Amino acid sequence: REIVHIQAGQCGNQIGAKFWEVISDEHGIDPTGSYHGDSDLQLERINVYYNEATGNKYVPRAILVDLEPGTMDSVRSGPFGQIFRPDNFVFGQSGAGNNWAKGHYTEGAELVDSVLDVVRKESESCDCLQGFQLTHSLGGGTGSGMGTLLISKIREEYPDRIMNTFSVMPSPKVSDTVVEPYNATLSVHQLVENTDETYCIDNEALYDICFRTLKLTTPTYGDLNHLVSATMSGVTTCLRFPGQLNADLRKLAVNMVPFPRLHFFMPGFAPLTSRGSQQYRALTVPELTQQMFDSKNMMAACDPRHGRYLTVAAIFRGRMSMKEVDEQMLNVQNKNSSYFVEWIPNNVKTAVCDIPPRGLKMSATFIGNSTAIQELFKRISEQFTAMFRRKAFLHWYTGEGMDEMEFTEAESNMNDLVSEYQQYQDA
Amino acid sequence: MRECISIHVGQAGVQIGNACWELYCLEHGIQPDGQMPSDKTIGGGDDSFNTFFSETGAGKHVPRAVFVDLEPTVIDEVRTGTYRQLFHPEQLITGKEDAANNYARGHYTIGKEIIDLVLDRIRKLADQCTGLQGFLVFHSFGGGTGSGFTSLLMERLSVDYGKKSKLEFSIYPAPQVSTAVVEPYNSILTTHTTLEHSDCAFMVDNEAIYDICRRNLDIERPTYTNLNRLISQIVSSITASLRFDGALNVDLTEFQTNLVPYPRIHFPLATYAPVISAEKAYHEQLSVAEITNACFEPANQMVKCDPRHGKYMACCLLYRGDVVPKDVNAAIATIKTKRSIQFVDWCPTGFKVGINYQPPTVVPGGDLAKVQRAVCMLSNTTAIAEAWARLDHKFDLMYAKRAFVHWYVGEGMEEGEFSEAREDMAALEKDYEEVGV
Amino acid sequence: MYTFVVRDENSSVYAEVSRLLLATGQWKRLRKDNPRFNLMLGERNRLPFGRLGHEPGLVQLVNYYRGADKLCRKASLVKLIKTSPELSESCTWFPESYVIYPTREVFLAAYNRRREGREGNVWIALISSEASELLDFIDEQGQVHVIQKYLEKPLLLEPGHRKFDIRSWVLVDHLYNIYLYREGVLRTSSEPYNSANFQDKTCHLTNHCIQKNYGRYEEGNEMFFEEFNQYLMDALNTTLENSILLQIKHIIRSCLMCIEPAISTKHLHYQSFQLFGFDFMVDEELKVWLIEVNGAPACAQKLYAELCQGIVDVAISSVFPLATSIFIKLHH
Amino acid sequence: MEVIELNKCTSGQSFEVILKPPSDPSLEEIQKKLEAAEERRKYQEAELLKHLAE
C-alpha cells in the first residue's frame, strides 16, 4: 500500500524536505539511501514511503515541484537532498509571485503535465496505491494555486485513490504578502471538494507555540518547521509502522470523516520541544494525555472548547503501559464528555508504536476533527472580506484572466463550510 | 458420515479459524504436516473426524476449510505458519485491497469481483464430499469483509446449496477491541442480509471474551491470540459432537432441531466454564456442580445479558472430562431450586446433555490451564436480544445524522438499505419480546 | 469527578438527589442520552437495563432493580405471594387476594365459604359487599384488577374514630443490604370510619391525595412516629416497636429476601439500588398487614432532606466515594 | 425429573432430562441488485468526471 508524496512551492518543499529528513532517520536510512538500522520494525512497512532500488537502496516516493528553482536547489543542497530521485525534480523558472491565479491558471498550467508524468511513473510502479499526500501552503502562489490544480488533475486520473494534504494556513503574524487571505480562500474552496483529509497546520498556531510556550522571542521558519516535522512524523506513525489497527489512508477517512466536506483536522503534539535543546525528564502517560488535548498543543489556532469533537485519533509513541494509556484516554473522554459529540459512539481511537521519535522517550500525536476548526476559516474569511469589499489587490488576479465572480463563489463556499461546522456544534 | 465445510471470512474469521484448526489437530492427534499416526485407514475413511478432515493417498489429513480475505496480510501468515502443510494453496483465497471497514465495499464493490472465485474453490471441496451436511461460517460483524462479503456469500450458498445447513460463528463488536467507528452499521447491515440464510448463529461478543481474559486469565490487555485461543475452546466444545462419536448433535440439522424452535430467533447463548489460568500455581479443581452452576453466571457467557429476565426455548450442556450423568442430574436439581430459569410455556423445561470423556485439550504455551472437567452450555434465551438493543441504539444515534452514510452510498448502496436493515432489526427485537414476556 | 444523568423529571425524591449531588462539587450532570455516566436516575417505564454496564472504564450504577416490578404491581404481588414457597398460601400478613381479569379462578369458592357463617364479606379492587357489585366493576374498566378482603375491623385513633395507613421507606443498596428509614408516616383519615356506608369512601380510602377535614387532628393528615408512639403508650400501654414495627421489619425482610435471587446485581456488569415504599394497615388486634409495595415512592415533605441525604451516603457514595445512621438494617 | 434416551459409547454418553412438560432470492435477482449498485457507482463517477470536465 504505497503512498505518493508531492511537495509544491517554497513552503511545501521546505516542510516536505524536513519530513523526509525526520522519517528517514526513524527508518534508519541515511543520505546515501542505505539502511543502517537496529530494528526490523524500521523496514516492515518501509515501502509505504520508499521505493527499493537496486543495490538495496531506498528512494523516497517523492515528487519535488515548484514554479521557481530557488527552493528546490536548496533542497538538493541540503542534507538529505541526494536521497531524492533526480528525475522527480519538476520546476519552472518564472515563479508564481504569491499569486494563486498564476499557480492555477497560467504559469502553473504550463508545468502541470510534466509533474503528472512523474506522478504517473511513480504510480505505475506501485503494487497497491493508497493515494497521495501533498505538502504546500495556501498563502503563496505555487503551493496554493498550482498545488490545488495538481490535486484536481490527480483526482481526474485517480478518482478512486485517497487525496491527503498537509496545508499550511497563513497568518499576519507570519505573512509574506497582503494577498494571502485571497490565496487561502481560493485554495480552501478546492480542498473542500478534492481532498479526503487535510491537516490544517496553521502558521498562527506555530507562531504562538514558538513565542509563548517555547519562549522563542523571534521565531524563524525553521522554528515553525520543527513543529511541523514533529507533527508530520506523528500523524504518519500508524502508516509507517506495524500496528493492531493495520492503518491506511482510506480507513482513516472512513473513521474520521462523517460528512465528506468536514475533513479538516486539528493536529496536536506533545511534548512541545524547541530545536536542539533536549530536556531530560520523560513525561508520564497522564502528562502526554493532557498536553495533547490542550489547546496550547494544537497546530491550528482554534479553541477546542469552542466546539465539539466529531472524531479523534491519538497515537502514542514510546515504551509505556498500554493499560495506562487506555485508562488515561478513557479518563479524558469521561471527564470532558461534553466536548465530544454524543451521536457518534466510540469516536476516539488510540494506537501505539514502540519506536519513539528522535530526542524523546515518549510522545503523543493528536488528530482531531473538531467543529472548532471553523474559527480558522472564520479568521481567513474575515481577512478576505476586509480587502474584497474594496476590491483591493484584485488587479493582480484579474490580470491573469480571473473574474470577480470566482472570488465571490470561493468566499461563499467557505462561508457555507463554516455554517456546516456550526450545524454539528449545536446538534 | 457427512462432511462439514468451514469457511473463514475476514481477519477475525481467518485468525479464529487458525485457532480452531490448531486445536482440532491437537485433539485428534494430527501433527502440523497433516499426518495422523492413530488413523489406521490410510488414504480415506468414514470416521467421525472425517467430517472435518479429508485424507490424501500419502496419509495427510487436510481441513475441509476455505479461507477468504480481501487482503493478503492475514491469510499469508497461514501460508507461512506452523500448519502451512495442512492446507492446499487453493484453500487460501486473497485479494489486494480490503473493504476499509465498509460493508458496502465488501458486499458490492470488491465482493462482486471475488464471489465467483470463492464459490468455485468451495465447490472443489464439496466435490470431495459423499454427503455434504452444510457449512460453518466464521466472520466478524464489524469488518467490511466480514460483514459485507459474508452476506454476499451466504446468499449465494443458499442458491447453490439450497438443501444444506449453514451455521455461523459471528464476532460481535466491542469498543475495547474495536477497529472501526461504523461497526454498528456493518453489524446491522450484514445481520439483516444474512438472517434468513443462517440456520443457527453463535455470537461471541468481544467484550465478554476480553473481560473473561482479564478476570479469569489475569491478562492486563488481552491480545487477539489471547481471545482466539479461548474462543476456539468454545467453538471446539460446540463442534465436538460433529467430529467425535456421540448420540447428541451429530449433524448440523440437529443444532436447528435442538436449539432453534423458531427460525429468526436462532442466536443461542454460549456459556463456558472453567476458565483457569496456567500461571496459577495452586488450583482447586471444580466439581460437576460448580462448573454447571457457573453456566448461569453472566460473567462466563459469550455475551453479557441477564437470562433471569428472559425465557428459555432450549438448553444443552456439553461436558468434557470426568463427568457422569448421576452428578449432572444432581447438579441440575440443586441449581433448579436456586436459579431463575423460566421456559416459554410451549417448550419443556429440560436439558439435553452430552458428555465426552476426553477432558479438554490445551495448546502448549497457552494461557488456559488443563482441567479435569469442563462444560459449555448452549441455551437459546431471549435475553440475548439485549445485544441487539445495544447495537441498534448505536445505529440509531449515527443514522439520525446519517453520519458516515456517504461512504456507503459512494460504493453503490442506497440509503434505503439502511432503514430496511434497521426495520428488520426492529422486528427482530419485537419477536424476542413476544416470546420473552 | 463522578457523572450522572436524570431520566425521570417527575421524581420528587431524585429531584433532590440531583441537587444534593451537584452541591458536593464532585458530581456533574450530563444530558439525558450521554452514555458515559456513572449513575443513572432512570425512567419509570421501559428503563433500558440492557444498555447499562457496557461502557469500558465506567462503573455504572442505577436507582432501580430490574425485575422489582413483580413486587410493586398489585397483580404480580398476589401471584408472587401465592407461588413462592418462601411466602406460601399460608401467609399470615397478606389479606386474601385473587386476580380476576375482565372479559373467578377460585375466588367464588372462597366467597361461598363465608356464606357458611355469614362472616364479614367486604372486599376491594371499588368497595362492595356482594361479589356481583364488585365483579361488574372490573369489566367496566377493561384492565386486570385484584380484589382483596377488606379489613372490616381496623385500628382507629381516638379522638376521631379514624383510619390510617403506615408507609415505611426502604432502601436496598448494591450489596442487597435492606435499609429501613427510621422515620415513617401514618396517612390518616380525617373522617370517622363507619362500616354502614362504604360508598362514602372517604373514611375508607386513606390516600393523602384522595383526602382532597384536611388538617384537623394532625397536619396534612400525617402523623409521625414520635406522635404515634406516644399515643400507643398513653392509649394502649405499648410501643410502636413492639406492637407494630417488628411485624413491618419481618414483612419487609420477607418480601425482599424472596425476590433477591431474581433481582440481585451481585455478579452483574451494572449495579442497582432502589428506594421502595411499603404500605401497611393495622387492625384492632395490633396486627400489621401488607397492602402494597410501591417501586416509585414519594417522601413526606418534612423528611426529604434527611432521607435523600441518606440515599447519597448509603446507596451512591458507597460506590463512588468522595474526599448515627438514619436507617435500620434488616439482617439476613 | 425423567432421564430419557440415554445413549452410551466408549467416547462418552448423552441423555435428556425433563423437569417439566410444556403448558430465498434467485441467482438473477442477486445479479440484478449487484449490478444496480455498480451502475449507481458508474453514474456517480461519470457525474464527477463531467464536473471535472467543466
Ligand SMILES: Nc1nc2c(ncn2[C@@H]2O[C@H](COP(=O)(O)OP(=O)(O)OP(=O)(O)O)[C@@H](O)[C@H]2O)c(=O)[nH]1
Ligand atoms: N475475537 C476476535 N475479534 C477480532 C479478531 N480480528 C478482528 N476482530 C474484530 O473484528 C472487527 C473488525 O473485523 P475484521 O475481521 O478486522 O474485518 P475484516 O473482515 O478483515 O474486514 P476489512 O478489513 O474491513 O476488509 C473488530 O470488532 C475487531 O475487534 C480476532 O482475531 N479475534
Ligand SMILES: Nc1ncnc2c1ncn2[C@@H]1O[C@H](COP(=O)(O)OP(=O)(O)CP(=O)(O)O)[C@@H](O)[C@H]1O
Ligand atoms: N384489605 C384492605 N382492607 C381495608 N382497607 C384496605 C385494604 N387494602 C387497602 N385498604 C385501604 O384502601 C386503600 C386501598 O387502595 P390502595 O392500597 O391500592 O392505594 P395505593 O396504595 O395504590 C396509593 P400509593 O401507591 O401511593 O401508596 C388503602 O389506602 C388502604 O387505606
Ligand SMILES: COc1cc(C(=O)c2c[nH]c(-c3c[nH]c4ccccc34)n2)cc2c1OC=CO2
Ligand atoms: C488512530 O490513528 C490512525 C488510525 C488509522 C486507521 O487506519 C484506523 C482504523 N480504524 C480507525 C478508527 C476506528 N475507530 C476510530 C475512531 C476515531 C478515529 C479513528 C478510528 N482508524 C489511520 C491513521 C491513523 O493516524 C495517522 C495516520 O493514519
Ligand SMILES: Nc1nc2c(ncn2[C@@H]2O[C@H](COP(=O)(O)OP(=O)(O)O)[C@@H](O)[C@H]2O)c(=O)[nH]1
Ligand atoms: N510554516 C511555514 N510556513 C511557510 C514556510 N514558507 C512559507 N510559508 C508560508 O507560506 C506562505 C507563502 O507561500 P510560499 O510557499 O512561500 O509561496 P509559493 O512558493 O509561491 O507556493 C506564507 O503564508 C508563509 O507564511 C515554511 O517554511 N514554514
Ligand SMILES: [Ca+2]
Ligand atoms: Ca481413515
Ligand SMILES: [Mg+2]
Ligand atoms: Mg514565499
Ligand SMILES: [Mg+2]
Ligand atoms: Mg482485513
